[PDB]
Amino acid sequence: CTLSAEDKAAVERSKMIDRNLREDGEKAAREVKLLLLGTGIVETHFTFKDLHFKMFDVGGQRSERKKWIHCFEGVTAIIFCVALSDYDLVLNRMHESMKLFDSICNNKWFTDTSIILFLNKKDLFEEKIKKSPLTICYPEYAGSNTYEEAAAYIQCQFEDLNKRKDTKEIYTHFTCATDTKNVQFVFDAVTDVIIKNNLKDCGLF
Amino acid sequence: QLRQEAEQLKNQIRDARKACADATLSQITNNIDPVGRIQMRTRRTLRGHLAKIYAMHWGTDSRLLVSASQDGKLIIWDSYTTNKVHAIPLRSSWVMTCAYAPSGNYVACGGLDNICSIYNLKTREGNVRVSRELAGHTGYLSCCRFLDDNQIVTSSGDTTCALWDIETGQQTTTFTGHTGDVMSLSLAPDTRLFVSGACDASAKLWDVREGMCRQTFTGHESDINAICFFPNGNAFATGSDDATCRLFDLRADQELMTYSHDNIICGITSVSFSKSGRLLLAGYDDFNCNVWDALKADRAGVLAGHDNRVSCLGVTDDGMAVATGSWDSFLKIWN
Amino acid sequence: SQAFLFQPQRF
Amino acid sequence: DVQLVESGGGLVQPGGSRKLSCSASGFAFSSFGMHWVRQAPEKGLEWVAYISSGSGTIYYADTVKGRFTISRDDPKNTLFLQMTSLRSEDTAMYYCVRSIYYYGSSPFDFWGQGTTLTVSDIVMTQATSSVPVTPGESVSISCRSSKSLLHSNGNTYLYWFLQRPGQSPQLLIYRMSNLASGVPDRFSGSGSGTAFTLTISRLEAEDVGVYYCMQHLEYPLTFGAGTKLE
Amino acid sequence: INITYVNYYLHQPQVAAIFIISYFLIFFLCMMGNTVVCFIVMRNKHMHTVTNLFILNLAISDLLVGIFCMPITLLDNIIAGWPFGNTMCKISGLVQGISVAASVFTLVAIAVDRFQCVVYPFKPKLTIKTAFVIIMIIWVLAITIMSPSAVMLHVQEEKYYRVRLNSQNKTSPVYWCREDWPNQEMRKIYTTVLFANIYLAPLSLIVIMYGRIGISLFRVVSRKKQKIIKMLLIVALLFILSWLPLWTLMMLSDYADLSPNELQIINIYIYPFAHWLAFGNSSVNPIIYGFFNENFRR
Amino acid sequence: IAQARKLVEQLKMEANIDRIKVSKAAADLMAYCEAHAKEDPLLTPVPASENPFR
């Protein structure tokens, strides 16, 4: 024994609190987190095929990301958006976006979190390819003026920056009219990442 | 020639400091006996959280302990018996700082939401409810300390600090002058002053009453993450990303001591002092903490036994125990 | 049966 | 506004059954343990039954075991006691009492209004049954315990209650030294071992009533006889 | 009455030497593998997951198998009769079965853990409490299923079979410890129960779960997936083929009527090879689970 | 312009302050540590009877 009545009641209260914490933790663990890169932090919630995705946006925080990016370690994947029309505009911004992608891919914290790449502004990029040649963005580009070829070259240039080819994969797609296709692709990539992590936890793989 | 005037003033401050310096702690305290091997063992293990711990604070009674985790929970622990007194849920899970009111009636939290939330623990309804939500900072909150039951001093990542009246909600005075984001702050024992460290590798002494900077110390060569006052109140210690601690003195207005080792190359997350100021406990990015002899700058001991990086570290008011929280989601009390 | 057929143990 | 309203009391015959209800509002009912405390027509307080948060632990008095059953309902914020085979000694006024147990908490802080039912161990001794007093004079109320109330943790589990004429009991001192919220600072409590006392300074007309001292060391909770102030 | 005299050392020096070498090889391999696996697990405090706990339990069970089965059974095959005693025969008969069943059951536990973690990626993982409860339940089930073996074991004194003490014409009797049974049908039923509870059901569960894992993985196949499938198929086929001979011999002896000559041939010459295969199967488990697991590799 | 003037004024204000020798500050720190050393549990461990965490 060696416990008073009030001490036993306090122990019971602590056990109840621990049970509530455990149930809340098991509820939270059933979710999937994503970080979006392109007053505080913006949160978005959406459920797709019996899985709850929570996307965090960090735009508007005028501070160096070196002091708070490590807070986002553990996310299932990082969703990186890139505007195809940003090849000629300068505020040369295409190279800045490429440098940002290289930094986020080579980040020490994100050495295993896969990256899902979205390419927007397709219907504007195809029309813009007729006036501004791709030689402005890429001095070394040797190809035709076909918008499909330029898109493929841009995708290859973005993908080749991945030094962590092993233990990190870069799923890639282009924006379309149907939101269902994009959310299904992100669900497939997240499911693949989760399955790979589960395999890594076990003995095999 | 305003820049020339600034350069001349900096040069004359440097000359005044150099002329002021006549001896060092090394040759003054070399004739004192070393503290010897310090062997602290773990006494209590608190394993309730489910995510990396980001902040913690002791109570004045030296028994109650508040902790904050990234899973959006603030847990109050009874250290002696390992009991959860309270479990407050947070609206935003990106918490990065916590504090305990000296009266023990309120708690404070803050983070990437740029809002300092004050919760009241003593309610007739028997539950814990948010008492105030102070807003106005344009960046993440790095630190906060309860100056009183109605006054709280906070530091944000927008290179500013503020003093808030909780009842009214508006900040009475704003301390500005840091070039980079402010990472930590430490109140003086008399509460008449405090000190703030920022990412511009400098620390500043702020007068609470007049809202002015009195002294600036620029010893470090990288961002300083931790700051703490000597129990006397005439000195303080800083820990930075250059794997080095530095002890500065307010009255001499320069750096007194440097704590660094060849085998230590990891940044410092937290710093704290013992009751008498002889021991300096520093938590590093390495999984173990270190205990330095603050007067001889020798490694007195090591506190090992964490799986992941130690995030927060505090010492109780009477010096009985040291609480350490890590990214492993465990809180360990050492004695 | 009952005869020493050099039967070893089951395992 | 904290409120406990009890109902379901009246006149019964011996051998019958009854159900007493206690509706709670204005506070988090699910975080509070509950007690039933009955008072005979002209007698002291007597503990009946206890239920904890989540119905984990249930305690009954030895005179109500096998006949009285306590239970609660958290979504509807109700607490009810079912009594079977009522006898003539069960006539009393029952009180719904809330009590929260954690470090540095004040149990027995709020009492209900009371419901009257008519049917037709550590020993605490109060030294003086009645005391005549005049305003502006300090007074002391002493009571003794048969077994030491000091535990190994350093807590003396003695509580003080005040029952005003036509009113519910109110907590004054919890754990022999701590003053309850809203109670004037003139009240003080001090004791050693088995003896304890409550000191009232600058006594006014609001202190007239009956003072009870109760032990919480063991769950067969025992109240004193009660000291009346004229 | 015709009586048969045999030597103290039943076998010739050459056959005895080959038996000794054959059993010592697998004994040495088992002890080294289990020792190194336990040492690695104990050294690495960080590696304390449920799968690692199951692997440690399997290594402990395999060490018990290698210690309490190989030397005693090799001695029994070498020297004629049972000279140890009734109490030791009962203890050994209990312990050998207990260790074998624990080793077999830990395989099913590991396979079900892997199936749960691979096929179901979103469901919560098994807790340490559940893993320890499962460990206790498999030990208890082993005790329950092979208590009768220690119940009915007993040494019998022989009369027609005698032993020379190799000199001085000492005509010692033959002590033959055996699982006494009031009915041969009772022994047949118990052997069938052991067969169904040790070899059939674990095999079916393991093969079904590994097939489900492979189908789920299949739904370009990378080298990682191919390696996983190869390892799973190797494990299943090894568990089948290593244990087939011993159970086949036991069921044949307890079910099929044979002449004394062929029965003696089976019990003297081909039983040691089946025992060797069965023991080597448990001996090889530490090496495969500590060599093909990337956590142990690092 | 205004920022530079404010910086110059602040730096001048921080410049015109009194300073004490490093020897005096070192002596003060040593004296405080020596005076308050006895009641430090971490420097001098307390017996297990009076240790609240054992």
Q: Please, how many helices of chain E?
A: 9
Tally the structural domains of chain E.
Answer: 1
Largest sheet of chain F: none
Can you identify the CATH superfamily of chain E? Rhodopsin 7-helix transmembrane proteins
Q: Regarding quaternary structure, how should these chains be classified?
A: heterohexamer
Distance between the termini of chain F: 63 Å
Strand order, largest beta sheet of chain E? 1-2-3
CATH architecture of chain F: Irregular
Task: Choose one word for the global shape of chain E.
Answer: elongated
Name the helix and strand elements of chain F from N-terminus to C-terminus, one letter apiece.
HH
Written as H for each helix and E for each strand, in order along the chain, the element string of chain E is EHHHHHEEHHHH
CATH topology of chain F: G Protein Gi Gamma 2
**Treating each run of at least 4 consecutive H or I residues as one helix, how many helices of chain F?**
2
| Structural class estimated from helices and strands of chain E | mainly alpha
Total count of strands of chain F:
0
- How much beta of chain E, percentage-wise? 5-15%
Q: Roughly what percent helix of chain E?
A: over 70%
Label the CATH architecture of chain E: Up-down Bundle
For the biggest sheet of chain E, the summary is: 3 strands, mixed
**The level-1 CATH class of chain E:** Mainly Alpha
Protein name (chain C): Neuropeptide SF
Modified residues (Phenylalanine amide) (chain C): 11
Protein name (chain F): Guanine nucleotide-binding protein G(I)/G(S)/G(O) subunit gamma-2
Membrane topology (chain F): Lipid-anchor
Characterization of this structure:
The complex is a heterohexamer of chains A (205), B (335), C (11), D (230), E (298) and F (54). With 205 residues, chain A is α/β, with parallel strands linked by helices. Helix content of chain A is 40%, strand content 18%. The N and C termini of chain A lie far apart (49 Å). Chain B is built from two helices and 28 strands. Chain B has one domain (1-335): 7 Propeller (Methylamine Dehydrogenase, Chain H), CATH 2.130.10. Chain B is 7% helix and 49% strand. In chain B, strand 6 (95-100) and strand 7 form a beta hairpin. Chain B is mainly beta. Chain F has one domain (1-53): Irregular (G Protein Gi Gamma 2). Chain F has helices spanning 2-15, 22-35. The chains are: A alpha/beta (205), B mainly beta (335), C little secondary structure (11), D mainly beta (230), E mainly alpha (298), F mainly alpha (54). Chains in contact: A-B, A-D, A-E, B-D, B-F, C-E. Chains B and F meet through helix 1 and strand 17 of B and helix 1 and helix 2 of F. Chain A: InterPro entries: Gprotein_alpha_I, Gprotein_alpha_su, GproteinA_insert, P-loop_NTPase.
